[PDB]
From a paper:
The refined C2-symmetrized map reaches 2.8 Å resolution and allows us to build an atomic model unambiguously. In the asymmetric unit of this sA3G-VC-RNA20 structure, a single sA3G assembles with two VCs, named VCred and VCblue. On the other hand, the sA3G-VCred-RNA20 interface involves neither mutations nor heterodimer interactions; therefore, it most likely reveals biologically relevant interactions. The protein-protein interface of sA3G-Vifred is biologically pivotal for complex formation because it includes A3G amino acid D128, which has been identified as a determinant of species-specific A3G-Vif interaction. Our cryo-EM structure shows sA3G side chains D128 and D130 proximal to the side chain of R15 located in Vifred helix α1, suggesting that their rotamers form bifurcated hydrogen bonds. The preceding sA3G residue, W127, makes contact with Vifred H43, forming a π-π interaction between the aromatic rings. The dinucleotide rG6rA7 is located at the sA3G-Vifred interface. The well-resolved nucleotide, rA7, is buried deeper and is accommodated in the pocket of sA3G NTD formed by NTD loops α1/β1 and β4/α4. In addition, the 2′-hydroxyl group of rG6 ribose can form bifurcated hydrogen bonds with side chains H42 and H43 of Vifred. We tested deaminase activity on ssRNA by sA3G, but no rC deaminase reaction was observed using in vitro deamination assay, even though base rC9 points toward the pseudo-catalytic pocket of sA3G NTD.
[name]-1 hijacks a host ubiquitin ligase complex using a [name], Vif, to degrade the antiviral factor, [name] (A3G). A3G is a human, single-stranded DNA (ssDNA) deaminase that catalyzes fatal mutations in genomes of viruses such as [name]-1 [Reviewed in 6–9]. Here we show reconstitution of the A3G-Vif complex and subsequent A3G ubiquitination in vitro and report the cryo-EM structure of the A3G-Vif complex at 2.8 Å resolution using solubility-enhanced variants of A3G and Vif. In summary, our high-resolution cryo-EM structure of sA3G-VC-RNA20 revealed that Vif binds sA3G through interactions with ssRNA.
Residue numbers in the entry:
A (entry chain C), G (entry chain G): 1 to 113, 161 to 176
B (entry chain A), D (entry chain B): -3 to 192, 198 to 228, 239 to 298, 305 to 362
C (entry chain D), H (entry chain H): 8 to 77, 83 to 128, 139 to 151
E (entry chain I), I (entry chain E): 1 to 112, 161 to 176
F (entry chain J), J (entry chain F): 15 to 77, 82 to 128, 138 to 151
The structure:
RNA sequence: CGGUUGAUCGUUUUAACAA
RNA sequence: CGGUUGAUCGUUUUAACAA
């Protein structure tokens, strides 16, 4: 087969939650520097044509990267218009996709041991419940 | 609202790549100044940013905003636009007819990208807009920094330019200069193209072969200057013409100084990579190994004479009904330069 | 591995009760939706998304060219009228494989999970709790 | 945004006076429902209000919003509009061509005022919009209360209706019925215009005198019903025609029951005040001093016969290629009623 | 039936041109007051159902009446609904049609910011 | 006058009715409207936007003989109308075939008149 | 002279201050009923064609009426687009126009003896200083 | 009265340093502004406004028909090229008169104040302090 | 100078019609794949400065070439810049012009959601 | 064929150039463009939107004699062009006066041809 | 164009500016 | 239509939704 694919679990979220997450991250990154070691990569540093942002969080000797997307297919619900998030953990060309629960646990273990930026509130589906 | 757009939309929309496909919305950041006691004072509340709709471009919304503003008609106003796409035909025509009816306001436009720069309809619309009294420029790095600091809700984050901003800006400046059909005033021509100066201005024309005869191209004629030197800018402008690989093209260059070492190497490599493009350089001064290498690569280096000067004056000079007048010491210096070049090469 | 897959909440949730459906262009008629899905499955130059019916979770099959760094298949010829999907991945540090199928007419089907540094992530999880 | 407009703009713009001059903006409040398991469930996030621009009417913005929504095409949707002005020609045509291409959405429109109801261009545009599958109604007090409670940031303040809301609503309903050219189905005609019923339906036509000859007016033909009785509504509709004071007009009325006491007094006063309008009432039943006073005021009270029934069936009945069929006991009852009326008057 | 008719010359125009005409005419008889002697008659003051509005320009003992029309079954882009303009010089029961040039010359003889001109209203670019 | 001969050369007339509808009903409507009256009939020149309008006399507030006749010859209709234009009493006559609503038409000519002539000469 | 006129001192204010004043009055009138005896007359109860609102405040046996306008001439400053306010005090067909300072003093003498609604903040010119 | 007029801050502010100007249609050319001002002064069916140059205070001359409940004049014939303005009123409980003039060419001029139940308002002012 | 020229029949159309044409053609050769055998040539692939785009419809041993044009000094509303369409049946160095009806009949013979039709593109309502 | 005679009756041709500009320079530009060439010349039919385009041969990628001549008679220009249409080799000839850029024009006719004729008969 | 409004598409066009 | 983008006017169109 001449078609080669990549597999990603993307949590479908609406636009307001994406905006709130980005605003909180940038507010706690520059104004109230509780998270100053984070690297907020801007839009166009990627080979994937649809990757709106990429937040890198150094955890000891590895890093947890949260990438958001825009321009995906529509969802089942009314406000899943093509935006989503995906969180993974990488260490020197070894990557594993991470549950948002575990991602927030890692974030609060290293950094936190305006509301604090959490990924559980970002990725939670408020339209299916 | 004054400056409350997120950085991601800014970075996505104001990318200045000449050919960019999936940006179907137009963003317009506007600011207004007023003349008081001979100085231009900023009007802090009359600024902001707008975006387009399905059938409602940002220019129309700006016109509605101006109508709602009710500016004093016994004053002078300067409006500055920063826009992602150049205005289309309808917007250009309506902006021209707005400028013709309100002579107390002037407009300056900075564009990130040119919209259908290969379409003569939009070229004519842009030329009419420029003739109406509007200043059209290409958005450079300083304007990008100003828009990032002023119109972007960056929260103090530093501006990170994308890759290739300067090259894209130079290419777009060259295309805009071609579209607007700029010309040199006689003082600049006399000061720069004299054979007896910290700037290098070069003119260029293109011809195509058809049955062993050279036919000129009306659109592919112009000139440019330095902002990297001008030769690199010209070589960056070249690839966007999409010259065909089956026909024969000849590019004639009229350059003031001789090309530098790096510029000559780049030109030689470019003309070696593209065998369908012949190069005819007719310089006026010398700024010799690089020149010899360029000549051996396939170029035809020559020295300007009276015929070339007359052609330049008739072609790329805004003489406005004034015949060319040669200066003193032209023929002797030209003959000496030609003899020196013949002895060297 | 096996015990972690059979004991953790996330893997059980994604492995026990899951049915998938394709919602690519929900505002378009059924015929061109089928045509677009077939074209996207055949060219290998565009993404295809499969959304879990209950939650907001989705599987995206990005083309390999969009990765830039580096078994899975989306195939048609096994059975007429159906598309079969296999996607290996690494989830929460363990190697897991997603298996599914959807029919070309209803644009619906089934999908579930199976089982098929590594120590550094285990150490991080132990220190996470 | 869902329901965040101030009460003052609502009260200023949704005033339902038929002739209102200085309201140059159009407000559109939209809501959407979806069909699930046979019931229509409200879509709480797909609702709000928009206003017009210099060259961007609210219908265009609603179409853009619908395009951005990306509704499931395998479902059924009902959209409700509450608008201050009836759509113009461009908006009506584009809404019609949107409805023709999307058969999974239906549209119901409530209008506060009719925009150029005397202009046949807008009348034809509205008729085309109604033919495309849209339901056009007149915004009554219940809809005003609903919009006040739902789309107005009233902060719990009670709704205070303006003076003359009901009369304006009835007049606008009459004009809309004239514009849309409604017709009675055969069952209603048979049930109501039988001489042997808690409703009174009346038809009306107008003629003008020209050289001792009556010429019919194509637009001034129609019928109406009760919501005050129907005669008061008809007398409220009358003044908006602006009948000239130099020519002679005759209004022919086809009413089911005899007018009441107050209705007869109002009609007699109206026809006494306007000497240029003759009245010809041809009733079918009797609901006698008021009738005698109305007849002595100048009216011509008569009883319907077979010719009048045939004219009514041909004129104000949606028979759809079906000839009139008289019912049993028509001639005897009509003759008895005519004899009784002749004996009384 | 066909024994009585009425004949006029009507120039098909666009609706925006009619709006421009009826805007400048109102402006010039209300704000600028240069043409305050002119008269304006609305749609409900005429017996013809197709008459849009009438403008009366006094020329001393006579007048110039310019009338607008909707409801024409001609249409501009074939919409079976088109506007039109008609010109009529009237002098004490005597009436005649006047081409736009002569009407504009009459207006300039007795009268006279854009000005209300008949050539700009009546000329065509759809066929020329 | 230059206006007359400018609008009297190679001028053919053609009917404009329910243009966005099929031709058969268009001639049917032209037929019955010409029979009964009570309607406006338009005849536009092909070259320019000049149009002859036929309005019923009841539409005017007050009040000259002119006719549209189709019963003298089957399949064609004849048009005759006098009208005073620029101070002269020109008469416009023409015909169109009933099958194609097209035909020919031309205007040939027959105290207040001299008053308008004096005013027109004064307006130069 | 056949022209008879009425004289009013109107304090030119911008749109944002008008909106804030109306919102505060209606919030302190219905939700937090500290000012419940006030009568907030809506738009169209007046003979003057341009009188957007009219707030009546009973002071003992008289009343202080504050009326706002829209549709006035433009002002000297940039944001004086045609809206204004005027405060007066009336007792049985006797009216006198009141300084905003004195108006707020009267308001606080009788009623107050989200920010409290004051007319000094409404009528103060923030564009001329 | 006289002492109150000469002692209170408001009356001194409006009587000592005040110059008026007409800004009716500030976005329109001078000629039609003059024409509109003349027309409005002559018909008596529209408002005319005069704004103090320094502050946001303005005098509006509403037509008497807009009042509905009930000496002043705006006259032209006293001097060619000028309009003279007299407006009696009741301010802060005392009877005051406003006198001014503006030229028709510059739409500018001068304007100042003069001096020319009643006891109930005095009692209210005394109790106000 | 005037010894060499080129003659074609060009039908003036509107820009929106050209956009509709080039949208449905792209849709039908990319998404629907009913006309995936057609070829599309852009503006920079032709020597004529006035050629907008070319669409090649294979008909077996021959082809039908439909070309769009900007830059025409005719204009639609007299803007000295108008679009145009030209049709050409081509068979191994043999070329001829084809009216829209015959071209549409050729397309329907070998081929076949709106469909790309030449009558809808070439017909006129500005003069008819 | 019906198409030919449909577009060959009472057809007059007229020049379309810089229409939004005065006439004198319009004929000057028509003159010098017809002299030098290197430009496109349009001739539209009055009735319909059919137009004859005159493109320089250098604009074509490859390669039949046809001319536009004004020096044989002053004040008028003659146009001649053969072109194969629908399988037949029709020749379009005409003239326009140089003063008014208007005139007359008509098309009269003179293995792959039979191949197209067979294909056309098959497409019925 | 304050007209018993015949209706110019008037900040009379705006969610937060005093949270 | 992921094309070395020739550019459909893609929530890739939005200030606060976790203040
Ligand atoms: Cl634009
Ligand atoms: Cl509308
Ligand atoms: Zn535009
Ligand atoms: Zn260099
Ligand atoms: Zn509209
Ligand atoms: Zn009653």
């Amino acid at each position: 087969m001449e078609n080669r694919w990549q597999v990603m679990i993307v949590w479908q979220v609406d636009r307001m939650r994406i905006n709130t997450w980005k605003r909180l991250v940038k507010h706690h990154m520059y104004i109230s520097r509780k998270a100053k070691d984070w690297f907020y990569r801007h839009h166009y540093e990627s080979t994937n044509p649809k990757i709106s942002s990429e937040v890198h969080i150094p955890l000891g000797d590895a890093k947890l990267v949260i990438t958001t997307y825009w321009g995906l297919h529509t969802g089942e619900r009314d406000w899943h218009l093509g935006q989503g998030v995906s969180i993974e953990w990488r260490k020197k060309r070894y990557s594993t996709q991470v549950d948002p629960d575990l991602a927030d646990q890692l974030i609060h273990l290293h950094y936190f041991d305006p509301p604090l930026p959490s990924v559980r509130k970002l990725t939670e589906d408020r339209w299916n419940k | 609202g004054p400056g409350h757009m997120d950085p991601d939309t800014f970075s996505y929309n104001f990318n200045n790549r000449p050919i960019l496909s999936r940006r179907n919305t137009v963003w317009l950041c506007y600011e207004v100044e007023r003349l008081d006691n001979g100085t231009w004072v900023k009007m802090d509340q009359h600024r902001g940013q707008v975006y387009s709709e399905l059938k409602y471009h940002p220019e129309m919304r700006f016109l509605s905003l101006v109508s709602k503003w009710k500016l004093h008609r016994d004053q002078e106003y300067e409006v500055t636009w920063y826009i992602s796409w150049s205005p289309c035909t309808k917007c250009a025509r309506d902006m021209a007819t707005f400028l013709q009816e309100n002579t107390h306001v002037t407009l300056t436009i900075f564009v990130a990208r040119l919209y259908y720069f290969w379409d003569p309809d939009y070229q004519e619309a842009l030329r009419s807009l420029a003739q109406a009294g509007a200043t059209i420029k290409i958005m450079n790095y300083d304007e990008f920094q100003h828009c990032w600091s002023k119109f972007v809700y960056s929260q103090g984050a530093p501006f990170q330019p994308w890759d290739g901003l300067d090259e894209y800006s130079q290419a777009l400046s060259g295309m805009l200069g071609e579209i607007l059909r700029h010309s040199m005033d006689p003082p600049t021509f006399t000061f720069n193209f004299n054979n007896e100066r910290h700037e290098t201005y070069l003119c260029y024309e293109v011809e195509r072969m058809h049955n062993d005869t050279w036919v000129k191209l009306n659109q592919r004629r112009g000139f440019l200057a330095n902002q990297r030197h001008a030769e690199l800018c010209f070589l960056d402008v070249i690839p966007f013409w999409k010259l065909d690989l089956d026909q024969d093209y000849r590019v004639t260059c009229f350059t003031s100084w001789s090309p530098c070492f790096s510029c000559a190497q780049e030109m030689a490599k470019f003309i070696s990579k593209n065998k369908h493009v012949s190069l005819c350089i007719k310089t006026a001064r010398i700024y010799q190994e690089g020149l010899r290498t360029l000549a051996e690569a396939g170029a035809k280096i020559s020295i300007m004479t009276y015929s070339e000067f007359k052609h330049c004056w008739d072609t790329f000079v805004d003489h406005q009904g004034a015949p060319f007048q040669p200066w003193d010491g032209l023929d002797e210096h030209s003959q000496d330069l030609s003899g020196r070049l013949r002895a060297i090469l | 591995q096996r015990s972690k897959f059979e004991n953790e909440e996330f893997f059980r949730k994604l492995s026990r009760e899951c049915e998938i459906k394709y919602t690519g262009f929900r505002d378009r008629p059924h015929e061109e939706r089928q045509a677009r899905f077939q074209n996207a499955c055949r060219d290998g130059r565009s993404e295809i998304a499969f959304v879990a019916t209950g939650t907001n979770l989705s599987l995206q099959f990005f083309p390999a060219s969009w990765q830039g760094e580096q078994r899975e298949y989306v195939d048609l010829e096994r059975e007429a009228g159906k598309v079969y999907l296999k996607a290996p991945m690494i989830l929460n540090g363990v190697c897991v494989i997603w298996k599914g199928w959807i029919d070309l007419q209803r644009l619906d089907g089934m999908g579930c999970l199976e089982f098929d540094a590594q120590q550094a992530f285990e150490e991080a999880r132990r220190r996470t709790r």
